[PDB]
Amino acid sequence: CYTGDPANNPLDRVRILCTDTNNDEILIEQSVLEWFYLESGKDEKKAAIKALKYLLFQVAKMGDEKVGGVYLRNSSRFKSLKAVYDDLVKSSVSGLPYAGGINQCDIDMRRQNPCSVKKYTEYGDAARYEGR
Amino acid sequence: CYTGDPANNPLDRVRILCTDTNNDEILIEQSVLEWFYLESGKDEKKAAIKALKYLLFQVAKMGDEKVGGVYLRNSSRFKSLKAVYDDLVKSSVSGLPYAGGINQCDIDMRRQNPCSVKKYTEYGDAARYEGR
Amino acid sequence: CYTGDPANNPLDRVRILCTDTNNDEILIEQSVLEWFYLESGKDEKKAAIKALKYLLFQVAKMGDEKVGGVYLRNSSRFKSLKAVYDDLVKSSVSGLPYAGGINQCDIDMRRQNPCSVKKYTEYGDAARYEGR
Amino acid sequence: VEAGSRASLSGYISDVFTICRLLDAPMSGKPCSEIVKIPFDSSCLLGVKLYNCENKRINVNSIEAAFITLDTAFQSPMTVNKDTNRLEYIFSQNDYKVLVKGKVYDMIVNVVDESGNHSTVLKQKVRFN
Amino acid sequence: APMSGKPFISGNCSEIVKIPFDSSCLLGVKLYNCENKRINVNSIEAAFITLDTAFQSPMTVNKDTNRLEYIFSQNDYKVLVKGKVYDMIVNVVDESGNHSTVLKQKVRFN
Amino acid sequence: APMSGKPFISGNCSEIVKIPFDSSCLLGVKLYNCENKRINVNSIEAAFITLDTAF
Amino acid sequence: MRLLNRHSFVVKRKVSEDGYYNDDGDWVASQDIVEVNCKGNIQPYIKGSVKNGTQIALPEGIRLTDTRILYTTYKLRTSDDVEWNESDIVMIDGHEYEVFMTMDWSQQLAHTSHYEYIIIRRDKMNAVRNSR
Amino acid sequence: MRLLNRHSFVVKRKVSEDGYYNDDGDWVASQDIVEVNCKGNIQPYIKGSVKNGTQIALPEGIRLTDTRILYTTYKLRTSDDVEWNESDIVMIDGHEYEVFMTMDWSQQLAHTSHYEYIIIRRDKMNAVRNSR
Amino acid sequence: MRLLNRHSFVVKRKVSEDGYYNDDGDWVASQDIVEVNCKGNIQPYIKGSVKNGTQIALPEGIRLTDTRILYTTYKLRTSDDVEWNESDIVMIDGHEYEVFMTMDWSQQLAHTSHYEYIIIRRDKMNAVRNSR
Amino acid sequence: TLTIDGKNKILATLTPTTIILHNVDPTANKVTQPVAIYFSEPDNGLIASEDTVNITVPATVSHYSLWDNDKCVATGALSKPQFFIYVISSVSVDLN
């Protein structure tokens, strides 16, 4: 039910972010999409990422069908959809890695934890005039 | 049947969490879904994890059927659905991994167990003034 | 629709940069393309990198369809298109690779960080008259 | 450099010929959806025909003070054309002063009978190109 | 020019009219009412032809042949860019001063 | 409203009637006996309409 | 299934089966007509000399004959002299289509049991009543 | 799609549907004829005793009969006595081809919905007018 | 292509199309006959009651009827009363074969556009001239 | 050669506000009292009347003129001289 108005309709913006903008091939129900949007509060990005996960399940279920004259084959859709999904979404890293013992401020901050086991010697023991 | 009212109907919320919302291909009976909802106390999230396994079992059973004119092929739905499931549910981890002997507040608590085998030496033995 | 006027029409320039110029097989809606163009500010090059991903998603969805007389088979378009994409866009590198400790003008700038762990010895320590 | 100039006048010594776009309103309830289009800043007559509960076309003899509403834009009164048996309206050039170009609007038609009851006899989507 | 927005047969995409660049060309229009019957131009007072970002001009209301007509000229091509696609709009004036956009069409000059 | 629980044609799922929110709507009902013939309302004394948890 | 429910149409069933012959001998159709909503699939019927949307030239003018095949899970019935009931009517494009043939594939298999009907467009003629 | 739009042809539709019978009884065709541009695909029709470009020998001389099948997404209409409209005309090789049959495959599937028509070359005859 | 040009044969085309009817009513064929060289492929035509090299027994004696199908890229024409031209002749085994049917597959595809013709052996009869 | 921007910026200044009919081409030969007229914004170097206007004559008229200051800025001839309400259906001025 994409009305071709991404400028105004946030539901259309979500329907663009998750690729379901085709009136003859509507796989995600309007009522389902609205509920996802409300659960995400108003974040179109989170609504879209929820709807994409739901769409994976929706596609994986369907299979080939034949009625007199008309024959639809769907067994190959999931392979392509998953291949695109893991490449474009699952593999996108966000945040930063961690490198232990590289930052003095981090080291001193973590030294304050009382519930931590105590090492016999640390890195800087040979240069502290005050020991400890 | 999915009534298109997830906001108000807790059963619709479950039918969304589980992906059995398509009215033409109802795979989970309404009575079965209600029984799951009751047996889970009343928790839409916690009913879905059982409904999904029931749906996996239901999908694994069916095969290809032909009757004059129509024809339906269900032999790949399982191979797609299990692949989706193992990725989106099975491999999702929750909780924390234990690391041995890293927390003093835990070591001292574990020391109180009477049925634990005595060790000849422990980590801090070299600096205990009192001994033991 | 591609109007055959890339020189004057910025939307035609985008429809050329993206390869959706064939009027018989319009795959990207004109409204969607305009919305991408606006969201990218106004940059034909920068809209194409989003339109291409949208097109990948659109192509991955479709399957084989038969109606009496006609018949269309779309199960390999994705396998070809992703192969073209990974070669012509994904593997194209831009920017420079960093090499550690090769530029003195960079080493001395990094030395100003206060939250960096002190090293006992550095490369030039053997020839510093002043020490430190 | 030259520009030339022109002048034009028209008139007569003592009708409406605007573009018309028609709709049907089934009172029976029984008729991803159509979107009516009207050029922006262009006068356009909008008409609607009533169909009774049996789905005949029904006389508009009854019905008074029918209203038209452009959602979150404005509300206006509508004319009960009892000759052609259609409820009619004409988008005036004042209306476009508060209408956004390109945006999609919802429209509603209300009917007030002789008993004071109000009925919503039509809902439709439109947009002004 | 079908009023009421009905294309006689529901095509797709956009059709482009092509005219030689430096040649006068008589362009006419035909009017059809809401029931696809042919309208008589006697009820039309005036009409303005428009080429976007190029110019606007009054247009000959030919009641004899029952068509609206405009003729390009060499001084007209002094602002038109060769090859570029120009949108086209036809406006009408009623007896009560109503203004209607009866037709929009894409044009270009070879 | 077919008495005896027979749907005239055995469909599936549930059908939902839709009415505009803020508009009066005349809602009627038709009665059919155990043999699908049309019943006359003369034999009815009273009837109570119900909307669950509403009124 | 999804393909068996692509189309939605109205069916007029004469619920009462009390048609009889008047004291004058004229036929009186069953009185209580009831409208219903059904879902199925409609396709042209290609076989032998069948005529789909065929224009027929006659000395009296021009006619139009059409006939289709309908797949559905709803049990429509044709005329039967032993059971003493009349046939159903299907509204397609606003015209009447009388059910003339039936093929019982029900109770054959679980997920593919259905029915097939051949429906012929009703010819144009003036109306007359004989009701007693 | 590309193969459905290989050919371009002209169609004469009698837009007005006001044909009537004179006070003398003669037929008067609808007045307003309108030309249109359409795209489709034209192929010979091979079935039974169909005659494609077949020369016919008669005592009066020689005739030529031809008939074809047309695939297109445009909705052409044949004669209909109930709706009271006349058939369309298709210009092939400069001659007229009257639409005699239609097959409605529309609204069946997303990317493969279309129409099929059987068009017969109009026979040669002299012209006469009865207009009132 | 190679298989479309396996055979070489002669074609007699009546280049002039000025045939007319004498002042006495007799037919006068077009005068200017021209010979040409063409290439194609000739095979027997197997369909229905078609007669290839079939001996026919009659009270008057014995006849021989033959007919073939010809694939070629050359545009041969049959008789046409509207265009007012006569059919071509193909020389096979030294006998005449008149083109009676045509099937236009041209402009369909790049490398496989061609024509099909059904050619019937001309019957034996004595000659008479009416030229004015 | 004036571009569209120049023409649009130009016609914004003219702003006529009255019209007078004349028995013959003109201040001379006035036949009717002036009546106001409102004009729309310019586009493509063209301005048109925003609405209809009614003029009355007791007498024949075959010409007209526009004023604003009371300055005459344009004149023109009626398509047909008319004996004698003369309704001015529309009027426009352009630089093309």
DSSP string spanning J6-65?
A: HHHHHHHHH---EEEEESS---TTB-S--EE--B---BTTEEEBSS-EEE----EEEEEE
- Write out chain F residues lying below 8 Å of G32, CB-based: 32, 36-38
DSSP string, chain H: -TGGGSEEEEEEEE-----EE-TTS-EE--S-EEEEEEEEEEEE--STT--SSEEEEETTEEEEE-EEEEEESS-----BTTTTBPPPEEEETTEEEEEEEEEE-TTS-TTT--EEEEEEEPPP--------
Are chains J and G touching, using the cut-off of 8 Å on CB pairs and a minimum of 3 such pairs? no
* In the block, residue with structure tokens 């695939």: H71
**In A, residues 10-29, which contact D (CB 8 Å cutoff)?**
23, 26
Alpha-carbon gap: J20 to the closest alpha carbon of chain D (Å): 12
- Write out chain G residues lying below 8 Å of C68, CB-based: 43-44, 46
User: Residue F42 and residue F35: Cα distance in Å, rounded?
Assistant: 18
Q: 3-class DSSP state for residue D90? A: strand
The tokens for E8 are: 């006689």
Greatest Cα-to-Cα distance within chain G, rounded to the nearest angstrom = 52
Are chains A and E touching, using the cut-off of 8 Å on CB pairs and a minimum of 3 such pairs? no
User: Residue C34 and residue A28: Cα distance in Å, rounded?
Assistant: 24
Of D32, D33, D104, the CB nearest to A5: D104
C-alpha dist (Å) from residue G96 to B19, G10, G27, G47, G122: 39, 10, 21, 22, 6
The tokens for D126 are: 């439109």
Q: Which residues on adjacent β-strands are paired with residue H39?
A: H8
Residues of F within an 8 Å Cβ radius of B:
13-14, 16
Q: With residue D126 as reference, give the H or E element that holds it.
A: strand D118-128
Q: Provide the terminal-to-terminal Cα distance of chain E, rounded to the nearest Å.
A: 24
Q: Which residue of C has its CA nearest to H106?
A: C67
Q: How many CA atoms are closer than 13 Å to the CA of A60, on its beta-carbon side?
A: 24
Of D106, D108, D113, D119, nearest to D28 (Cα)? D119
C-alpha dist (Å) from residue D30 to D76, D97, F20, G9, G20: 27, 36, 13, 11, 33
User: Residue E15 and residue C3: Cα distance in Å, rounded?
Assistant: 9
Of E4, E15, E1, nearest to E47 (Cα)? E1
The tokens for G80 are: 């039967």
User: Residue E39 and residue H28: Cα distance in Å, rounded?
Assistant: 20
Q: Answer whether D33 touches A (CB < 8 Å).
A: yes
Q: Which amino acid is at C108?
A: D
Dihedral (Cα; B46, B47, B52, B58), 10-degree rounding: 150
CB contact (8 A) between residue A5 and residue D103: yes
CB contact (8 A) between residue A63 and residue B72: yes
H104 Cβ contact partners less than 8 Å away, ≥ 6 residues apart: G44, G53, H115
Chain B contact probe: residue of G105, G109, G111 with most B CBs at under 10 A: G111
Of E57, E75, E98, the CB nearest to D43: E98
Q: Answer whether C83 touches H (CB < 8 Å).
A: no
Q: Which residue of A has its CA nearest to B127?
A: A120
Q: Answer whether H2 touches C (CB < 8 Å).
A: yes
Q: Answer whether A69 touches G (CB < 8 Å).
A: yes
- Write out chain A residues lying below 8 Å of C100, CB-based: none
DSSP string, E89-101: EEEEE-TT--EEE
- Write out chain D residues lying below 8 Å of F22, CB-based: 118, 120
Q: 3-class DSSP state for residue B57? A: helix
CB contact (8 A) between residue H6 and residue I103: no
User: Residue E33 and residue E4: Cα distance in Å, rounded?
Assistant: 8
CB contact (8 A) between residue A61 and residue B101: no
Are chains C and E touching, using the cut-off of 8 Å on CB pairs and a minimum of 3 such pairs? yes
Of D6, D111, I40, nearest to D120 (Cα)? D111
**Spatial contact of D91 and D40, defined as CB atoms under 8 Å apart:** no
User: Residue D2 and residue H9: Cα distance in Å, rounded?
Assistant: 46
List the beta strands (DSSP E) in C24-105. 64-66, 71-72
Alpha-carbon gap: F4 to the closest alpha carbon of chain G (Å): 14
Q: 3-class DSSP state for residue D127? A: strand
Q: With residue D74 as reference, give the H or E element that holds it.
A: strand D74-77
**In G, residues 51-70, which contact A (CB 8 Å cutoff)?**
69
Of I82, I87, I103, the CB nearest to H44: I103
User: Residue H56 and residue H59: Cα distance in Å, rounded?
Assistant: 10
Q: State residue C98 phi and psi, 5-degree precision.
A: -85, 140
User: Residue D97 and residue D100: Cα distance in Å, rounded?
Assistant: 8
Chain A contact probe: residue of H108, H114, H115 with most A CBs at under 10 A: H108
CB contact (8 A) between residue G41 and residue A67: yes
Of J85, J82, J66, J83, nearest to J17 (Cα)? J66
Q: Answer whether G59 touches H (CB < 8 Å).
A: no
Of F18, F19, F23, the CB nearest to D118: F23
User: Residue H94 and residue I118: Cα distance in Å, rounded?
Assistant: 24
Are chains D and J touching, using the cut-off of 8 Å on CB pairs and a minimum of 3 such pairs? yes
E28 Cβ contact partners less than 8 Å away, ≥ 6 residues apart: E62, E65, E67, E68, E69
- Write out chain D residues lying below 8 Å of F16, CB-based: none
List the beta strands (DSSP E) in E15-77. 16-19, 26-29, 46-51, 55-58, 60-62, 67-71
D68 Cβ contact partners less than 8 Å away, ≥ 6 residues apart: D46, D75, D76, D77, D78, D89, D107, D108, D109, D110
Q: Answer whether D127 touches A (CB < 8 Å).
A: yes
Alpha-carbon gap: D29 to the closest alpha carbon of chain A (Å): 21
Of C61, C78, C79, the CB nearest to A19: C61
Of I19, I16, I20, nearest to I33 (Cα)? I16
Q: Which residues on adjacent β-strands are paired with residue C71?
A: C66
C19 Cβ contact partners less than 8 Å away, ≥ 6 residues apart: none
Of E27, E21, E23, nearest to E71 (Cα)? E27
Query: For the CA atoms of chain G, what is the radius of gyration?
Result: 17
* In the block, residue with structure tokens 């009349």: G86
Q: Answer whether D19 touches E (CB < 8 Å).
A: yes
Q: With residue C81 as reference, give the H or E element that holds it.
A: helix C77-85
- Write out chain B residues lying below 8 Å of A57, CB-based: 19, 81, 84, 88
User: Residue E2 and residue E9: Cα distance in Å, rounded?
Assistant: 11
User: Residue E45 and residue H87: Cα distance in Å, rounded?
Assistant: 36
C-alpha dist (Å) from residue C79 to B79, C60, C82: 20, 9, 6
Are chains D and A touching, using the cut-off of 8 Å on CB pairs and a minimum of 3 such pairs? yes
C-alpha dist (Å) from residue C116 to A15, A103, C102, C119: 47, 5, 19, 9
Q: Which long-range contacts (CB under 8 A, 24 or more apart) does I108-111 make?
A: I108/H6, I108/H43, I111/I1
**Spatial contact of B71 and A65, defined as CB atoms under 8 Å apart:** yes
**Spatial contact of H72 and H4, defined as CB atoms under 8 Å apart:** yes
Chain D contact probe: residue of F18, F23, F25 with most D CBs at under 10 A: F23
B48 Cβ contact partners less than 8 Å away, ≥ 6 residues apart: B14, B17, B18
Q: With residue B66 as reference, give the H or E element that holds it.
A: strand B65-66
User: Residue D98 and residue D79: Cα distance in Å, rounded?
Assistant: 21
Strands laid side by side in the D86-90 sheet: D19-26, D44-51, D86-90, D79-81
CB contact (8 A) between residue E98 and residue D16: yes
The tokens for C51 are: 């339109």
Q: Which residue of A has its CA nearest to C52?
A: A88
**Spatial contact of A78 and A60, defined as CB atoms under 8 Å apart:** yes
Q: Which amino acid is at F49?
A: I
C-alpha dist (Å) from residue E66 to C108, E61, H6, H126, I115: 86, 8, 37, 30, 47
- Provide the 8-state DSSP code for D96: G
- Write out chain G residues lying below 8 Å of A62, CB-based: 2
Alpha-carbon gap: B13 to the closest alpha carbon of chain A (Å): 9
Q: What is the resolution of this structure in A?
A: 3.1
Strands laid side by side in the C64-66 sheet: B65-66, B71-73, A64-67, A70-73, C64-66, C71-72
User: Residue D106 and residue D71: Cα distance in Å, rounded?
Assistant: 5
**Spatial contact of D111 and D93, defined as CB atoms under 8 Å apart:** no
Q: How are beta strands A64-67 and G27-28 bridged, if at all?
A: unpaired
E–J: how many Cβ contacts below 8 A?
Answer: 44
**Spatial contact of E56 and E70, defined as CB atoms under 8 Å apart:** no
CB contact (8 A) between residue C65 and residue H111: yes
Q: How many CA atoms are closer than 13 Å to the CA of D97, on its beta-carbon side?
A: 4
